[PDB]
Ligand binder design. Sequence first.
Ligand code: NAD
Ligand code: NAD
Ligand code: 6OH
Ligand code: 6OH
Ligand code: NA
Ligand code: NA
Ligand code: NA
Ligand code: NA
Lengths: 483, 483, 483, 483
Amino acid sequence: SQLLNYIDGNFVTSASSFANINPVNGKLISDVFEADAKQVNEAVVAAQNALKGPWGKLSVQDRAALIHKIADGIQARFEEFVAAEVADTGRPVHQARTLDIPRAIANFRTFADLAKTSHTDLFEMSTSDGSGALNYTVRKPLGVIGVISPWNLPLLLFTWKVAPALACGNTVVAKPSEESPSSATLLAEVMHDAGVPPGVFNLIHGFGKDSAGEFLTQHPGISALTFTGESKTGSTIMKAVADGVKEVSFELGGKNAAVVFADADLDAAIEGVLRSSFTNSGQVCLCSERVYVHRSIFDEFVSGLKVEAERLVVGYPDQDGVNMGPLISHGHRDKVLSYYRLAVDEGATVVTGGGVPKFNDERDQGAYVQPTIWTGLSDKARCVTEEIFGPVCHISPFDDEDEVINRVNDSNYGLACAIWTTNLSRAHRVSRQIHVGLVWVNTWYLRDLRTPFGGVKLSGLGREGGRFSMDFYSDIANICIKI
Amino acid sequence: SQLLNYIDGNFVTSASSFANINPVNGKLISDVFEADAKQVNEAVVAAQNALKGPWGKLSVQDRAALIHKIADGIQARFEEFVAAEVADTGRPVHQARTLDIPRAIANFRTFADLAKTSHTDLFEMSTSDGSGALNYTVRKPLGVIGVISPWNLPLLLFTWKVAPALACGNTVVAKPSEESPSSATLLAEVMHDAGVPPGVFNLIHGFGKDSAGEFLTQHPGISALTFTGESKTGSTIMKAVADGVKEVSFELGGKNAAVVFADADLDAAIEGVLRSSFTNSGQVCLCSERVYVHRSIFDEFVSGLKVEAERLVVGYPDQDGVNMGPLISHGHRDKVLSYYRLAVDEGATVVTGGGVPKFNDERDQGAYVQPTIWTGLSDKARCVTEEIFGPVCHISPFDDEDEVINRVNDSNYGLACAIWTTNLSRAHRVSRQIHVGLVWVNTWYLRDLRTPFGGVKLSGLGREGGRFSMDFYSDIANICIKI
Amino acid sequence: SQLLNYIDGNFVTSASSFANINPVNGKLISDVFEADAKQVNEAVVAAQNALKGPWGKLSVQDRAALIHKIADGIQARFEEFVAAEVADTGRPVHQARTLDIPRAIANFRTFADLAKTSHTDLFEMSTSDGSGALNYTVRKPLGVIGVISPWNLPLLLFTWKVAPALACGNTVVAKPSEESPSSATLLAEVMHDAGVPPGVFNLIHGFGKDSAGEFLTQHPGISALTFTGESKTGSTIMKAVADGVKEVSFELGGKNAAVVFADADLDAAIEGVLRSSFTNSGQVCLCSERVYVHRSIFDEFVSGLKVEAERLVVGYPDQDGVNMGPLISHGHRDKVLSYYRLAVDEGATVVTGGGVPKFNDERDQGAYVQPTIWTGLSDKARCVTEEIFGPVCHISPFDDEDEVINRVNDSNYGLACAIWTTNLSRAHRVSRQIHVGLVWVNTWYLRDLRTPFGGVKLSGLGREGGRFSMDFYSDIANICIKI
Amino acid sequence: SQLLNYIDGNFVTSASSFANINPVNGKLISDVFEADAKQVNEAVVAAQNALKGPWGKLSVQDRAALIHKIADGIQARFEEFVAAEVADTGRPVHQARTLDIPRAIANFRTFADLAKTSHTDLFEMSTSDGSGALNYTVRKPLGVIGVISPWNLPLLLFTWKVAPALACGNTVVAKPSEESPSSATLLAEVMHDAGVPPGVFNLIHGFGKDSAGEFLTQHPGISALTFTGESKTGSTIMKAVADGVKEVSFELGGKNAAVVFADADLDAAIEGVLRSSFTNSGQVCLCSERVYVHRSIFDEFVSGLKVEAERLVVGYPDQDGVNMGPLISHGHRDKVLSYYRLAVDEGATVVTGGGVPKFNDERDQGAYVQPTIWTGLSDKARCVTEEIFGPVCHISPFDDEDEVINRVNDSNYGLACAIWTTNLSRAHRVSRQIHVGLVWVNTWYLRDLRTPFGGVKLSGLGREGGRFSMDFYSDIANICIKI
Ligand SMILES: NC(=O)c1ccc[n+]([C@@H]2O[C@H](COP(=O)([O-])OP(=O)(O)OC[C@H]3O[C@@H](n4cnc5c(N)ncnc54)[C@H](O)[C@@H]3O)[C@@H](O)[C@H]2O)c1
Ligand SMILES: NC(=O)c1ccc[n+]([C@@H]2O[C@H](COP(=O)([O-])OP(=O)(O)OC[C@H]3O[C@@H](n4cnc5c(N)ncnc54)[C@H](O)[C@@H]3O)[C@@H](O)[C@H]2O)c1
Ligand SMILES: O=C/C=C/C=C(/O)C(=O)O
Ligand SMILES: O=C/C=C/C=C(/O)C(=O)O
Ligand code: NA
Ligand code: NA
Ligand code: NA
Ligand code: NA
């Protein structure tokens, strides 16, 4: 199969392509045309031009309706979206069916709804002459939005940036991850078939450095760049846009902690930490790679977790009760296994996992690894401070509330934390002292799309979610009328 | 006179120093101790540690009452602050008495109040098990805020940053412009005498490149950098913080237009452009350096403005009916005089001014220039497109509304615009189509401190003012409780 | 046997019926079953109980979706709703097609959406013991809402109350006007077919006093009473609910003015006042019955308006260029004719109309009156102070701005006013001085469902629209957690 | 001591005077001049004219400063206000100094602040012709506000209404309770000395029926009636204003419950219920008169409470560690002892209290009763269902969460509830199911002035607190400009 760019209402190829690899089994799924500078430029210019076309004349109610028509379009090809996401990533079918695609549909519908009910402010004031004045605010499109996205929840995160950009009347030039270009390509078809005017949504394929990613980022025609990926890539991109002083919104790594206090419901914590460490084969920015458990229940916790971890079915996306699929790619398994080793050297006890499973079939040419649990490491070990982004956690005991708060916060990252406790005072007292953007108490990755959703310190810049997306993807302008 | 740094509750000197010059007569006002990389380091460390002391334990109410006392202490020393801003900048006394110092006072009071009345959000949601969940947001300090401010409205822009930073419970390290250090140092004294705990507010004197400015900007202990200055300086600072992925807030240059339509109140428009072009001797980012006037009134508008500009009194800050002081320094005057020549070279008719007035007294050693009006340059001329930041405007005719709108918007800046018309529809039809952060109709620089206040494109990054300042100087964190 | 009640999920008849008459020709359209005290009680109890059934358990997202299915179900029977509205009221078919039915559908949609996007508040505080507390608010259904609506925009006004009621999770007992019951009956069939659970929406037919209206108003089981109708009926209802201290929300009469200044677009103003005085045969609470025109344009305005008014086509709802239908009933027609005479006794010049047109066909048995224009009455004439609710305006000259503002405000009502001027200052300076809930400048009855939409003084009690409807139809509860 | 009315800038006496009696010892404190209908009229008319005078021309920020001046005036006479509250009511001096007087000051300050920070809304919309329109809202004074307040928290509740009234630019005619007129009279003095324009604040003394209160309530010149007091008086007043359709805001009775679960911190819960039942001698609308305790800890709870209640000191307001003063009056004490007898007749075990203490001094001429606990009554008993408004609670066991929720909600009132539990889920699951305006978990009457603060069912009509007071005390008007 072939994946083409979508520029100014046209599918187009390039002077080059790269392969897209299925990671269940190393096989080739598709050729993907790499967008070059000229093609990027042609994309930005057409998104510029589309702002002064029929898109820009739509009322907010008619724009909202079209976006709902985009969402209806995805629902109408639902099983194709599932297949494309799975194929690219190895994600279990069931989870692409209940989380990834439905969420993408809800991203468009939610931001269309926000854009319809959103309004601005009126300020009255007195003047020397006694006649007064009015200041009012108006909401406009920011302009052309560059969107660069990652591979771990391809459609979910691509639509999280694209839906609010379009809802706010912007136009978009979007560059999905090289590793998962398929669901995005299908979206371009949904856009086209829905009647989205040419130039409004442009899809470019490519890599980062020296490819479409970077050219987008350096193009003076964009007004903003929203990005999700590695912290180091954020810093790079921040440098690249600096001369145009472009608006930037970044969601970046974390090294997230879960915390289990003595008075937690132990079973629920074990189950919750299981999900939080090994969901999507631990390839979510939100996953817990450090776990702190109070000393009085530490051994029981580690035993319980070891057991549930070994019951995880690691297999075919469509295999009966499968829980995990592979990593995204071999290159990413190379990094993960490299942490697995570094853990050993640094002194870790391997409670479970620690290498790759053996299938005796095509999956052995894929990119699977095992759910791993470590113990024994100190707070300064590299395997406890750096993001691995695999199905791994380290577990460590603690004694004191103040102590464990300090240990959770002793990080250059700040995305999420989960806390397990049945106590009312503790939950609210400890939550507010954790230096992260998202705390969950007795659950994990529960989602309400109205909330601010982002991290502090190296884990982000700005916030998105709810009115914070409405603010980022819009230009607020103040008009003052002297009376 | 000597101006010391203020670090961790103590006024301190440095190993080096530089001169503060009175632009009215070129004389020495004070010596100012440059802070080195090392002292910048102490100020930051102390500001970090101040977060974990008494300041960090005050209620929102007590924090606000202490900020009201800062304001009372400026008020108690009102005339000394007036004298300080005048000496540094040459500004007319009446302007410092009515705009500059009362605004620095109201900036503290406004943000104190905003901090008392501000709340966050509560979201309720259903969950699969029927028990529901709550997500609530809380408002924390961002951390250490680095503040770097310009020389044109020194205490006003300085406090516009420091007030919300402190009201949101941050600690601060602030670097005022080398050209206008006095009011900031007096402010450090007020802070001290009001009992602001040590480390909350730190004042570091110095320059930018390879100095205090640069150092603050590179220190990893800061959580954010807020800045007002040149667009290119913004670009540099954005590169400098990119490795730490620090929150950034920028208010940068402009090349602002005023538009005078045929049905304008002409005499009121002439007066308004006079004020918008020549206030503070054109040294305000808000000033109008491009002016568009409908062809049927262009010649009469030009003649009227000439007359009014030639009546302006250019002189001592406390001279009788003084309207305009000098430029900030000889170096800035060199830059302005250079653009004055450039305009003649690009074909300008000099309608008035275009040189330096001759006093035959001490002021001739100062940094004065004449108010200047040009005519006859094309929209491509550099003088019509680059920020001069002097008492100058160019005046060009137009015939058509859509035409003028495109000429205003054809610029890389987007700070402000003023429009003059008596027509209800036009006011609101035209205003919304200007691609700037601030439009005024039939006035200029009329302020309501609740509004968003900043520009688009090269004129800004983020927004401040009202709840935009509270959003930027706070960390908004989400807490999700599964019920 | 044609129009039934709908109580607890079944259509039911009653012990007595009353005639519904077509105002186009005085013919019987239907027999309507009048609910008695016992049936009103059965409806309140069933609504009470449905709050504890499945309706009570739906999530906000699912409730909203169900409300969108109510909307979809109206859309699917679009032409039957049109035919129903037209049959009861004689409204022109094109108007029912473009205003009445689409707005009823959008009422349901807009409020479903607001229910989904609305959130509440979170307040942090300090406490003496240094642990702090949180206060947060939650929105809950008020309970059973009793809805009593009028005959002039039947489905539009009925759903304007029913949609936010249901959107906030209440249940409803709703009594449409005796003169226009058909569209509400069809609405119940839509509710039924959409699977709205039994008891959630209940329809009772009848009159006011000694009938279903009054009984609903006195029943101790309702939590609120929302009403649209005459002021005097509002007072009676406020007394009836007083022992129960029920929440109330009333939208009552007005005696609205239009004001035309010398600088208006005169042709637009004549067209504007034509719509504002004669739309729906002047049977809209928002219609202009008093017009003030500046003396320099008075004769011209009056002459232009005469011509336009005598070009209005008064006739059959499906007749070719029809503009006006009949009045709602012979009873309402006699009230209006009684005012037409009083106008002549009080000294009015009849510029046009003043009686009933002669059709020489079955329309002569209907309830038509002519569009009428008066001149020469005094500001204290009863015809200029009491609401007529017919297709009638009096036009009076004025001279000064202060004077006409005082005459507009000299009224016990305060619903709406329209102002015609092209001057920017005047628009904003006058509009703000008019003591009404709604001012339109250079237009009339322009509608944005997000806005507060009601009147002051005798014209209203409380306020609906936007977040104001969400406030009224919700119970807001504050929960305080000591930490 | 004499207490005059304050009408139109002047203190004035009346044709008749009544006695204010000190409830500690039955001695005469003052004569109070009852206002008659003519004087009420005089007040309302002055208040109307005051809206067109200097008060009406104040900027918001000036109005606010002046309200801060009122608060400073009270702060300057702090101990005189303390002595005046104490003498009228017998409340402990420490309660007056820590709650009553400071809250009255903070009411004025909080609302002044809110008046300065508050803005309104801007709605942009499309129109047929593609030019669009704008809807903006403005905030105006409502008009004259009639205020009627009770005797239990005289100055706190009086100023809780007067303050937001004045902050929103209304004028006021206010009638304190005949039982507690002194602090309000001193408030009139403060207003006058603060330069509050004549007619802006008017004070009238008297009773309800056939006196100042009724007459206020029936005057056509008021725009609204805010009222705190018994539910029955609520109804009477809602009737009286019905002919005028005046805005109304009522805070009314309750029969509040406290619920102690098995996992409560029992000693904290005992202290909390002791404070919630016996503060101000149970004469707060917020007090718990019904308490439910889990069966497993019921006996231990009652024992513990008995001991603590028997250690309460009942006596003079300045007596050492006094906890309770007398009831407000001999009449109120007759009502309370009536309910003490009824309880015995209905079968209650008197756990402690149940009579009047014996003092052997002037306190035996006062209106003291003992703190009283009952056990053994059924949910239907009158003493468990009707509001007593003295220092009494009944305690009953329970077994199941859903059961105790139903028992609390089984009431015609819905003011407040307090819940004691250490369990996180329980606090939030149970809180949200209680049908009241205000729930406290692990505390009672902890207050943040930003919150909504009122009850549901018979306990209330409308809501005040934070922006709910700004909504009630303002006229929000919508202006729509066709562009
Ligand atoms: N919301 C969040 O906080 C969040 C969520 C999920 C994943 N992540 C991150 O996702 C990452 C997975 O992807 P990765 O390791 O390949 O990240 P990456 O930063 O290398 O690249 C992700 C995206 O950035 C593009 N890119 C890379 N270099 C670029 C450059 N110089 N200029 C422009 N674009 C460039 C890539 O093509 C891709 O589309 C993880 O490292 C993790 O930190 C963050
Ligand atoms: N938004 C507004 O402000 C607005 C809008 C449209 C119409 N109106 C009013 O609509 C009115 C239509 O005339 P109308 O005779 O229908 O007004 P009405 O007040 O007599 O009747 C309106 C509704 O109230 C019910 N009703 C009448 N008396 C009652 C009683 N004692 N108890 C309970 N319910 C009672 C009626 O049966 C009907 O459903 C006009 O007179 C006009 O004032 C107001
Ligand atoms: O953003 C990073 C992980 C996100 C999960 C989401 O559901 C989301 O971003 O919308
Ligand atoms: O910020 C640039 C000019 C600012 C003037 C102001 O009044 C302000 O920033 O507050
Ligand atoms: Na792949
Ligand atoms: Na200087
Ligand atoms: Na009819
Ligand atoms: Na008394």
